[PDB]
Amino acid sequence: CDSYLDIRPVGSVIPQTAEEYRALLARAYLNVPNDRGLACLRSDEMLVNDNEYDRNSYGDIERWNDVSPFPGTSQFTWSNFYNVLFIANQVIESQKEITEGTPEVVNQLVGEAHLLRAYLHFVLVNLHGQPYTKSGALNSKSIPLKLDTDLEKTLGRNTVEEVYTSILSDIEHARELINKEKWETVFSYRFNVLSVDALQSRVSLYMGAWPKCLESAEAVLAKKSVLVDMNETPLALPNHFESVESITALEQVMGSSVNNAVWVPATFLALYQEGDKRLAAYFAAPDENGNRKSSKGGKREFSCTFRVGELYLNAAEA
Amino acid sequence: DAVVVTGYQTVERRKLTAAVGKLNISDETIGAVKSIDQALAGQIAGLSVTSTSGAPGAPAKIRIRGTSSLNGTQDPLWVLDGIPLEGTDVPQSNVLNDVSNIQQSSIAGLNPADIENITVLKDAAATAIYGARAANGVIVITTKKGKVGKPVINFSSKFTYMPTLSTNRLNMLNSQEKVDLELELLRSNFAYGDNKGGVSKIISGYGLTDAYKKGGWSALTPEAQTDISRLRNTETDWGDILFRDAFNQEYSLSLSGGNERVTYYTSIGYYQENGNVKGVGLDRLNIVAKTSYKVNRMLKFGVSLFVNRRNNKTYLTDTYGLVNPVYYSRKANPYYQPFDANGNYVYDFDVQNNSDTDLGFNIFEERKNTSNEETINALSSIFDAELRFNDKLKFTTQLGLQLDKASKEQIADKESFSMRIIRKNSKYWDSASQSNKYFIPDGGVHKAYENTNSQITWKAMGEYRDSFNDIHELEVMVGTELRKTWYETLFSAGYGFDRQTLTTKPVVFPDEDRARQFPLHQKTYKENAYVSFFSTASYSLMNRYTFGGSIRFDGSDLFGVDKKYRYLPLYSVSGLWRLSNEPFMQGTRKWMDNLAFRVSYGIQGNIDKNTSPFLLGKYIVDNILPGGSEHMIDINSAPNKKLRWEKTQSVNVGLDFSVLNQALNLSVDYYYRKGTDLIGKQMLPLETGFVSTNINWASMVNKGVEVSLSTRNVATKNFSWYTNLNFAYNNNKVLREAIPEAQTIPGREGYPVDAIFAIKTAGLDEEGYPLFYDKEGKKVTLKELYRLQDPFGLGFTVNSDVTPAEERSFYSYIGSQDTPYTGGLINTFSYKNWELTANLSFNLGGYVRTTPSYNFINFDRGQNVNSDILDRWTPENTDGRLPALITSEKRADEYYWYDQKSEIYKNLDIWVKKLNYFRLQNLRLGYRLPEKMTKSLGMGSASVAIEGRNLLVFGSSYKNFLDPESMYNPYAPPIPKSITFSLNLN
Amino acid sequence: NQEYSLSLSGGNERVTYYTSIGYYQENGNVKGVGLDRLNIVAKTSYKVN
Amino acid sequence: VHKAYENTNSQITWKAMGEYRDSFNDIHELEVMVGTELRKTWYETLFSAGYGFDRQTLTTKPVVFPDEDRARQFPLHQKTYKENAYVSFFSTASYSLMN
Fold first, then answer.
1. Are A12 and D55 within 8 A, CB to CB?
2. E strands of D25-99, at which residues?
3. Which positions fall inside the SusD-like N-terminal domain (chain A) (predicted)?
4. Partners of residue D19 on adjacent β-strands
5. Which chains touch A (3 or more CB pairs under 8 A)?
6. CA of C10 to nearest chain B CA: how many angstroms apart?
7. D55 near D25, Cβ under 8 Å?
8. Is C37 on the interface with B (CB under 8 A)?
9. Which one of A220, B244, B595, B716 has the minimum C-beta count within 10 Å?
């Protein structure tokens, strides 16, 4: 005699309110994988220690040993990327269903989800996809785009052009939806309008779309261009989350284990000419071999996704 | 009869296009059963009934056409007077001791004396009108009704004698050979537990534990020899201390009747049933009040009320059943006397399966100091209204309210083993004292459970019946149904409890985990709603071709909100062709009454009620930057918007054939039911966001034959003989399921749900260890089979490179626990006033994995053991067939591989045994008093009957076990034999 | 508030029967206060001899 | 906090009486009833309190009372049981004269 089919089970937390979805999106933010540190381990700015345990994990990545790594080597986190993508898509699909929230809060939540999805797709297509500027790389399949929360389908790899089109669309959606100007310092990992513009600038820089890259970089600089002056504070790290230069402090790029296992090769330090305060600020005491350690990461307070110096560099390059 | 009740309509037999099994209920048919789920064993072909336990009130596991689901509902749906019942599901767990506390189904509240018919709907054409509750079959209960005429009153009284449980089939050691085994183990180097036992304590109390090992019997002082002789000469009957004979009672008074406008029925019934274990009992008192009034030639309103109250008393056991009297009859030492010379308690310190003797157990002390008592109050009310709008058009509405309330109370005093284990498990490491303390207060425990199961159902269907040109008949029904169910449970425990003072004591849990280990207050709430729209059509042509169909759209809060799957039809198409009515076959009508061929197709559905389409998560505290306490949510279960019912595609081909004026009736059905989208755990692609989750992806198949043959062998004025043979074969097979990569036993894919995979052994080598088979078919040892390597040489440092995928190839498929061939044979003789019914049942073709009679690495000598320990390999007895008691002295690598992998010994093919048993379910002889004698007494009729239940079980041998249905679970009592004398008066 | 009641009764020379089903829902003057009741009565008296 | 109360009140009554009614000389009327009654009543109460209770999660938290005195004003488990039985024998007489 009684039936409506609208019953929510009791015994577990089911996100329905804006605070619950904010908690879900915060958990998604926390689990953002720091695979750009491992990606830059593949570059010329890192040297794994002469140890055995410290090298059996990161040695093959540095040597560009794609075929037959040591099975104990470190692996890029596909699972974490797509789990955070699932949470972002769940937040996106849950719009028009978020209860107990101001429209300026629900809109901000959905815009943060859109921008997080765009950034995760960008990082995935950068890690495992051919560069956008490479000839013959526009029609090459790179990564499967996750644009829903379906658990019964197998996703096929999308071409780089499709991935970047989706990234641009999500950036536009976040720009239309994000309405927060600045978050708290302790909660600065979340995305704001400056984050939208900085991500658009970086995306357009990687695509080679110099006009839009310059436009977004100049918009960020007009809204905020204050830097950290190295000459009044030699030990002032620009990437510190409390600095006046960081826009978003989402991902701690350098994990503790990877930062404890690498040096800065003497060639990269030799690239630093005399008179650079970054030489004496970024790195630690010199080693007998001539390669220093680093002090720009390895702990949670050095989280940095966007900052104004990167915007200056993007604007100059464009 | 001439009609079939499906719970929604009444279908004529001549227009029945579905597989339906009927069973008329009376004393002459089912016997003196007290629950109706236990009266169906062997009475309907295709309906396999198995006993989960022998204790009173234990539910019966019923399967119609095999298991239709993997992780969903597997029990049939019980429909009482058109309103489906709730709480009839049988809870299935892993722990073998849970049968000690299994909940009774609501079916135990319905008196079989108030039921006329049992109709079982088997195929898609019969069940598809039940939508997403049809894959497991439907059992429709038709309760007795008032008959128009003079009032009829019945007074049945049944008195049952239950013989004592004889443990002679347990094949246990007496004091002599038990003491001899203990002495020979003390001599040998098998020292897993040498502090335990009776001989070991006696010898070690005099400091002779080392002298005996070196010299032997002569190395013992006569002070230590007279004690062992006294142990040998002390014999205790544990089948008399633990088990008992019983006198059970049952009374039923049913008065009914009616007149041209109102039909009434009233009934009261009270029974008391004792268990074979002392202290176990169950009372049931129920009232039935039905009355149906005819308001006008169109309106008709009826009210049926079933009120039930059950009271269960039983023993308290641990979580893992170290106390269980049925299992303790296999652990109690033959020479251990519970009482000393002065009558004081003597405690059994060898009761734990571990090497620690600190908690003593006395059966009398536990029976005196513990209690497990439950009370169940049940109610089922059905208000049914009918409006005959027209000769052809009729409307019906029906409201059914069901409410079951179970209140359980378990009390364990301070001086009882059940409290000793609780206090021992409360051991924690006190950081400030560098010691071990117990946080459970010194005193008893009182645990209270309150479970409530509610249901409200509302059905409304309109039926249209028209006939055109006297050869066309059309029957159309359209209806809807709203059904809401609630299940609320509460649990409360108080430690420090005093039985008389009723006062508890505060508990200080060291952590939150230890507080969850001893819960003090728990609440559980489940609520579900279902909206269904169904329709049925039937077209009969020339009384020869009947074409039927049904459709049902089901929706629930347990399904996803995806529009692609939201309301998908659950349909059926049926067809009947009566070959006997064909003009070309009228020549063969002097001996053939019926020949009908029926076919059916359709899709059934199942609901997995333990799966949710919502995002179930948990609150955690964490942060992404230094400082601040962000409240985050971690996803526990993935949200599945495409959750839906488990599809089942059924095809049934039938045949009915009656000859010689119902002299021989045959009903054959061949069915093939393939299940898809069964809800199960699948390893998802990593792009879905999760490694694995429960989705609709599994597959299954069942197929086989149901044969129901009924014969009238002798038809004479005085002597009549009838035979009813029901046979059913089911070929169950899992087609698509996933297993964990770490699993070492093979998956069921390609084999039944209860497939048994065992490691085939070739016997023993010259040292008594098991011998295995390799891929080439030659006899190898464990070291060769697993390729064990011991580089360190320490023995316990062994390792193997055998991957789980390769270890799965060591096991071989033996059989299935569920017997494929099931059925029964019922023989009915009637000679003048005497009537003898012999109902026998068979379940053939099964296999059962029995617990090893002894462990060859972990044999506990402080507890008794089966008589086959004497047929093990010994250096002095090299002709033994069972494995020897091995140690780490001879082959450390093999010994430690056996030790750290306990499943190798448990899964040997020598512990798997055939399961083919015929059981004499009923043998009842009744005498109807002569009409003149009844008239002299003023009774319309009278009758007496003497009845034997479970008197005979034969077939395959079940050695060391009390019953072939008791070969799997040692903690459940066997099915008890009974002799009932019944008197019926009118 | 709303109350409903259905009382069906009758009898004949040997058996007399009564049945009733009622349901009322009442609200208090204080917000969030309410009380409902569902009642069933079934009586049957038979004259055996 | 989640507090659950469960109060059960049961009763069984059994009456058995006999009436004798006679008329003498059309002016005396005698009515004598003699009977007995056995009654039994049970009243059980259970109370269970859980603190730290979350309405959506149905999970509670442990409580550490300073002593037993403070554990009685915040009880977590209480049980009460009261059973009584009554046996009665009654009789009535009535005598009507000349109406």
1. no
2. 28-50, 77-97
3. 46-205
4. D33
5. B, D
6. 8
7. no
8. no
9. B716
